[PDB]
Amino acid sequence: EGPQLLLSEAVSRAAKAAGARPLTSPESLSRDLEAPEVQESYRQQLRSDIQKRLQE
Amino acid sequence: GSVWQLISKVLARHFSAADASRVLEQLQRDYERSLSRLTLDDIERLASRFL
Numbered sequence: 001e002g003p004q005l006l007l008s009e010a011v012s013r014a015a016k017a018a019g020a021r022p023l024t025s026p027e028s029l030s031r032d033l034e035a036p037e038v039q040e041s042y043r044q045q046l047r048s049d050i051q052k053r054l055q056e
Numbered sequence: 057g058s059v060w061q062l063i064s065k066v067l068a069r070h071f072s073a074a075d076a077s078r079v080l081e082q083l084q085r086d087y088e089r090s091l092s093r094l095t096l097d098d099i100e101r102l103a104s105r106f107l
């Protein structure tokens with residue numbers, strides 16, 4: 001479809017493709033992925049990379 | 057420093073060592089494929105969504 005805007009959904013899809021199941025729970029993993037620092041770093045990476053590919 | 061490093065600290069709390077590494081590599085691969093498929097059409101549509 002497109003680049004996943006929500007990091008929690010990106011990780012869920014990655015884990016499913018890798019056949020990885022959490023030691024804890026998907027709910028605990030997702031709570032940690034929503035930490036402001038983690039979400040903000042992801043947003044910034046995304047913004048940087050999109051701009052750079054746009055630079056053609 | 058990077059988002060990959062922050063994500064890896066989170067993964068180390070919820071996945072075995074082997075699984076955490078596999079998940080990070082799969083995530084980086086999915087991400088880069090997604091960027092590759094990106095077109096001018098998609099970027100334009102993105103701007104309409106938020107502002």
Ligand SMILES: C[C@H](CCC(=O)NCCC[N+](C)(C)CCCS(=O)(=O)[O-])[C@H]1CC[C@H]2[C@@H]3[C@H](O)C[C@@H]4C[C@H](O)CC[C@]4(C)[C@H]3C[C@H](O)[C@]12C
Pocket residue numbers: 043044046047050051054099102103106
């Ligand atoms: C990159 C574009 C803005 C384009 C722009 O403004 N600059 C392009 C200049 C092109 N040029 C004029 C140089 C062409 C020259 C041809 S010329 O006609 O000049 O000859 C902007 C528009 C909408 C923005 C996204 C959305 O917000 C949603 C989200 C918000 C997050 O926070 C950060 C991530 C994300 C995905 C954003 C990323 C990025 O930020 C986008 C795609």
